[PDB]
Write a protein that binds this DNA or RNA. Structure first.
Ligand SMILES: [Ca+2]
Ligand SMILES: [Ca+2]
Ligand SMILES: [Zn+2]
Length: 860
RNA sequence: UACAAGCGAAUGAGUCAUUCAUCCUAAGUC
RNA sequence: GACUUAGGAUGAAUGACUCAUUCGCUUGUAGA
């Protein structure tokens, strides 16, 4: 392996490098750059309070103007940035700003009472202890709230919120009838207030509904709340507490960035409340919208972080823009591979970029080597465009860091001031985040997680993902720049490109005057003036003439440039079709018999000079094989030397228009006028027969005999009741079987569809086990003996009792107890049904039913 | 959408194993 | 005409894993 799909290896991630490099705690006066965070909601819902995120570095003015949408539950919330100036923070204001982020991001995410009551009875506050280790100088933010009240502009930081948060922090550092901790409050209205508990952490959301209940009120193995806090914490309540608070508690982050299931069921549940006495509660004077808006931040900052790695790569290729200035949101989905769940995932750019690279390499090797023959050029073109050579060029330029295999679990998300309750420790060995390449880190082994991240940044890469990412970057620079834009990217990676000497070939051909008209009639049908008469004449001579000039080198250039034209034509018109259907639509146009069908339709084949009489009989056979229309389809496939003519035309006029490429598509558009469209697309018939028979569940066997010049083949299919046959003979025999397949398929369309023994004579092999065995043996047995597929029916069971006991090697507790009864339709007999009993898996229930029907099938 | 862990089902992707293909560019043997 | 290998762009059936979002149940939680 050298870049295939089985070799897997580590690669290190890359930090943002525009996020932070240092901090102003030495100079004791620090200046920041501000970036607004406003939220606009589609559903009316609730008005989200704004934020601002600070840095030391500024942004690249395309990241600083971004619009994104967030899919919360059913509502859709938009988000934007729109930067606002600068800001200068004094020392004590910088100390108040740190406790805010260390209090809220440790409130809903993690715990801020680090101390075990069970291990050793000592509890801390997490802010008394030695912090700044968590910051780990590589990530720096200081997100701050903003008062959204604006006359024209609101650059305020809402300092009452920061002072209240710092006041309750220093309070917990020290540690009619109404009573909180620290605040008496107002008995009148206490809705939408925000509290903290003192005996535990977990700052709470909206308190509401002061209910007619005491602290001595029935719990629902405890009688009242008072004995519960007397027992579980050893805390007596200072007041009898005729009021009592119920409140909504705080969940975690949910990856509210991609609509997984809203637009494709989520049966929502009522909200689980909690109760606490009010004298265990200390009051914060912060608003509630700033508490509802915390959940929106670890979804927006992963976009804003993934766009910084986009703009860092964009400024790393370029030394001189021609006019190409592409969006940073197109670098982002040119690198993210398909394992990351997102909208667009770089395969669609890759299908374009491979053909761009093939075209540039083919015309470059044509123009550099005028003396070298066709097969020797295709080997050097095989050396450059290969999928192992790009792996040598990609990881040498350190592009492997940005590859984003990813899953984006949002639960970890290492913040600046977060304690991060979910660590996965480094068992990888080395401590630097980037790995050097060595066969210790290469592997060919399953049962390992692809894309899962270590703390330092390591992850396994499929190594096809790093090899085709060089092709997608070429594609991205083509769709937003021009062809001259994607010449600089091939100049970056080290692929040699030399488009200057395109004069000398036509020069040495047009000084071939008198050594070594009928060419007039060819230019009527091409609809082109043609600057050089000799170049057009050169792309005609078969090889029968035995002249020094050849027409297969221009064919080598022409198939490449025509592949690139057809694959850039399909890329713009159909925006939604992936690479699996686009490859089929491209194979419909560059089919080699399709080009033979075009060269006869425009009556261009008669200009071909040839002396091989073996070929001449095939032309006479092929043109008489045409039928009347609708178009005239051929009876046989015919020659490949006739279809190479229209490919050789695409190379000659390319040189005569001097490497211009919009002119050649102006010529071949009227010649190719019935271009294919995905509804009218007709698969080659044997492939469609195979993909039809595998879909329904019917099996067929094939027979082939290349007896003489005439080759015939028969296909026998097995339906549920009747067998079907198809005959077919052709000289090649590769397609003759496809013609027999089409003869059977038009018939099959008329029925409106588009160790142990067997019963007596057939013989089952030795039985297999381990979760997939007998279904595999039964499937291979149904493939050999032409039977249809069995259909499995199950019966789902549920037990609320906390044991469903099924035997085996282990005890195997469960909750399922599945059992399944199947039917096996055997031709010209009756259907047979039987059931298994045990083993609470769907698949293992199917397996037990297979074993039971094979034991019943023996005694019959 | 209180949190963590385990068992089960549905949907969608990725890799692997076995056996059959479609399309183009080259090469060798009989 | 047969077969094999090298290079790039792909698809279908059956089976095992892994990840992603949601749902039912169970033990535990300085959760109530
Ligand atoms: Ca590829
Ligand atoms: Ca050809
Ligand atoms: Zn590691």
């Amino acid at each position: 392996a050298a870049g295939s799909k089985k070799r897997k290896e580590l690669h290190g991630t890359t930090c943002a490098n525009a996020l932070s490099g240092t901090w102003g705690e030495n100079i004791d006066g620090a200046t920041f750059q501000a970036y607004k965070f406003d939220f606009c909601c589609n559903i009316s819902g609730e008005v989200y309070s704004s934020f601002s995120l600070l840095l030391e570095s500024t942004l690249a003015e395309d990241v600083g103007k971004v619009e994104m949408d967030l899919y919360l539950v059913r509502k859709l919330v938009k988000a934007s940035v729109s930067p606002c100036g600068q800001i200068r923070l004094s020392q004590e204001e910088l100390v108040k700003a740190k406790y805010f982020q260390q209090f809220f991001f440790n409130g809903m995410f993690g715990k801020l009472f680090v101390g075990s009551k069970s291990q050793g009875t000592k509890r801390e506050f997490l802010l008394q202890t030695d912090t700044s280790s968590l910051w780990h100088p590589a990530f720096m933010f200081l997100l701050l709230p903003v008062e959204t009240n604006d006359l024209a502009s609101s650059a305020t930081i809402d300092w009452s919120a920061i002072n209240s948060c710092a006041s309750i922090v220093e309070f917990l550092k020290k540690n009619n009838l109404i009573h909180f901790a620290n605040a008496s409050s107002d008995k009148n209205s206490l809705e939408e207030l925000v509290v903290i508990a003192i005996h535990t952490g977990r700052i709470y959301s909206i308190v509401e509904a002061v209910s007619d209940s005491s602290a001595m009120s029935p719990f629902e193995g405890y009688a009242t709340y008072a004995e519960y806090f007397n027992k579980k914490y050893g805390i007596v309540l200072a007041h009898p507490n005729q009021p009592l608070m119920k409140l909504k508690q705080s969940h975690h982050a949910h990856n509210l960035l991609v609509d997984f299931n809203e637009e494709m069921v989520r049966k929502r549940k009522p909200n689980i409340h909690a109760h606490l006495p009010p004298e265990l509660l200390a009051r914060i004077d912060v608003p509630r919208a700033v508490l509802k808006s915390i959940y929106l931040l670890p979804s927006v900052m992963h976009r804003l972080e993934s766009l910084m790695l986009a703009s860092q790569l964009r400024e790393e290729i370029d030394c001189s823009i021609d006019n190409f200035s592409i969006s940073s949101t197109s670098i982002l989905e040119a690198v993210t591979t398909l394992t990351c769940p997102e909208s667009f995932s770089m395969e669609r750019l890759e299908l374009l970029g491979d053909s761009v690279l093939k075209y540039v390499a083919s015309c470059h090797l044509f123009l550099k080597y005028p003396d070298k023959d066709e097969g020797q050029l295709s080997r050097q073109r095989q050396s450059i465009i290969s999928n192992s050579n790009l792996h040598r060029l990609t990881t040498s330029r350190k592009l492997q860091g940005y590859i984003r295999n990813g899953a984006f679990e949002p639960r970890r998300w290492t913040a600046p001031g977060q304690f991060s309750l979910f660590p996965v420790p480094c068992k990888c060995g080395i401590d630097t985040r980037e790995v050097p390449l060595d066969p210790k880190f290469f592997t060919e082994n399953m049962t390992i997680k692809i894309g899962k991240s270590c703390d330092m940044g390591h992850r396994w890469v499929v190594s096809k993902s790093v090899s085709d990412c060089a092709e997608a970057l070429i594609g991205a620079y083509y769709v937003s720049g021009g062809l001259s834009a994607s010449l600089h990217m091939m100049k970056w990676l080290g692929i040699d490109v030399d488009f200057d000497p395109n004069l000398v070939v036509e020069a040495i051909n047009r000084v071939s005057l008198r050594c070594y008209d009928e060419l007039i009639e060819l230019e009527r049908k091409i609809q082109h003036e043609f600057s050089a008469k000799f170049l057009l004449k050169e792309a005609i001579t078969h090889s029968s003439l035995r002249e020094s000039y050849s027409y297969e080198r221009l064919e080598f250039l022409g198939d490449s440039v025509l592949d690139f034209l057809i694959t850039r034509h399909l890329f713009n018109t159909y925006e939604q079709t992936g690479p699996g259907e686009m490859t089929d639509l491209r194979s419909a146009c560059v089919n080699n018999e399709n080009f033979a069908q075009v060269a006869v339709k425009n009556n261009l084949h008669t200009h071909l000079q040839r002396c091989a009489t073996v070929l001449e009989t095939q032309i006479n056979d092929y043109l008489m094989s045409f039928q009347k229309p609708g178009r005239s389809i051929p009876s046989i496939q015919g020659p490949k030397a006739l279809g190479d003519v229209v490919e050789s035309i695409a190379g000659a006029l390319l040189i005569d228009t001097r490497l211009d490429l919009d002119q050649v598509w102006r010529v071949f558009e009227p010649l190719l006028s019935p271009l294919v469209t995905p509804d009218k697309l007709q698969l080659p018939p044997y492939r469609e027969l195979n993909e039809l028979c595998d879909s329904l569940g019917y099996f067929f066997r094939v027979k082939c005999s290349n007896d003489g010049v005439k080759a015939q083949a028969t296909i026998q299919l097995q339906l549920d009741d009747v067998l079907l046959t198809g005959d077919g003979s052709e000289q090649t025999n590769k397609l003759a079987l496809g013609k027999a397949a089409s003869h059977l398929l038009t018939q099959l369309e008329k029925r409106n569809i588009s160790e142990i023994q067997s019963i007596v004579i057939p013989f089952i092999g030795p039985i297999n086990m381990k979760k997939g065995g007998p279904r595999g043996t039964l499937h291979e047995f149904c493939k050999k003996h032409l039977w249809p597929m069995p259909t499995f029916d199950t019966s789902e069971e549920k037990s609320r009792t906390p044991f469903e006991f099924i035997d085996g090697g282990e005890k195997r507790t469960s909750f399922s107890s599945f059992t399944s009864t199947i039917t096996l339709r055997i031709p010209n007999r009756e259907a047979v049904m039987y059931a298994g009993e045990a083993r609470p898996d769907k698949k293992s229930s199917f397996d037990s039913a297979v074993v039971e029907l094979l034991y019943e099938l023996e005694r019959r």
